[PDB]
């Protein structure tokens, strides 16, 4: 009898996960309005309160300017549809500066430093109709049947 | 202020993010009976609940 | 000779939730960090690194 040993590697990232500890900025004084937000997808601002201070956000839509990307949290997120979502009427962790892992639906790896283009639903796509100030950071990987991309967000 | 004109209670732990409370109601009746009686009215109870964040 | 490293994050609310529910979240991340270091060492031995010669 011959003894045997095995080996297996973990995955690199998860959707909506913060990439690395470089200089980042999280805007936690936000509230979800009119729908559900998927972690790892861009969000927009519909109203910034002049006195109260909170910002009202929802999923991205055609002809709108994105603001940031929601991130993972084991306390502020509800587990629905076999994944993490941000439910309507709750506080959301929105990142507006730094490197983040983001949902994607393209097929080819991007080039470093080029501009990011988004789809109507708020996911990265190489030929999207939405223009962003963001750039590509070089990370490009795949969780189980899920594509992910590393994106660098600059403060609006 | 709202903290002086309304009651303040301390029953919820700092880790809970949702809570639930219940109220109960009763149903039944009674009747004038005689000895050697078999049919006696029955009673029952029920409850309802509400949530908070 | 070369150096290796990573890190992890955790918030106060998660710490309290782990202390209350009985399943902490920090020890899992520490184990993941150690496993990542060991697997990186194994991968360097058995696959190399072209940029680092």
């Amino acid at each position: 009898q011959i003894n045997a040993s095995y080996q297996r590697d973990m995955a690199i990232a998860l959707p909506g996960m913060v990439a690395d500890t470089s200089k980042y900025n999280i805007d936690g004084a936000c509230v979800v309005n009119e729908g559900d937000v998927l972690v790892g997808a861009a969000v927009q601002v519909v109203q910034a309160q002049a006195v109260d201070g909170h910002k009202l956000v929802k999923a991205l839509t055609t002809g709108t300017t994105p603001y940031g990307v929601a991130i993972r949290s084991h306390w502020q997120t509800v587990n629905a549809q076999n994944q993490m979502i941000y439910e309507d009427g709750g506080a959301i962790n929105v990142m507006t500066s730094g490197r983040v892992w983001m949902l994607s639906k393209s097929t080819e790896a991007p080039t470093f430093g080029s501009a990011v283009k988004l789809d109507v639903d708020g996911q990265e796509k190489s030929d999207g109709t939405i223009e962003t100030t963001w750039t590509y950071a070089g990370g490009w990987t795949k969780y189980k049947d899920i594509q992910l991309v590393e994106v660098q967000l600059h403060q609006l | 202020s709202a903290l002086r004109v309304f009651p303040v209670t301390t029953e919820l732990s700092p880790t809970d993010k949702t809570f639930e409370y219940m109220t109960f109601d009763k149903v039944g009746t009674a009747q004038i009976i005689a000895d050697y009686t078999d049919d006696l009215p029955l009673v029952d109870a029920l409850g309802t609940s509400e949530f908070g964040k | 000779v070369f150096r290796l490293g990573n890190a992890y994050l955790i918030s106060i609310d998660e710490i309290k939730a782990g202390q209350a529910t009985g399943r902490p979240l920090s020890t899992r991340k520490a184990s993941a960090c150690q496993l990542a270091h060991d697997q990186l060492v194994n991968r360097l031995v058995f696959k190399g690194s072209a940029p680092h010669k």
Partner: peptide
């Protein structure tokens, strides 16, 4: 419309199961 809820008649097993990643 009852007196007890499902959560009051539930039990969570003490032991959990962990995925395995051999080092090599």
């Amino acid at each position: 419309m009852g007196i007890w809820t499902a959560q009051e008649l539930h039990r969570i097993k003490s032991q959990s199961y962990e995925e395995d990643y051999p080092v090599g």
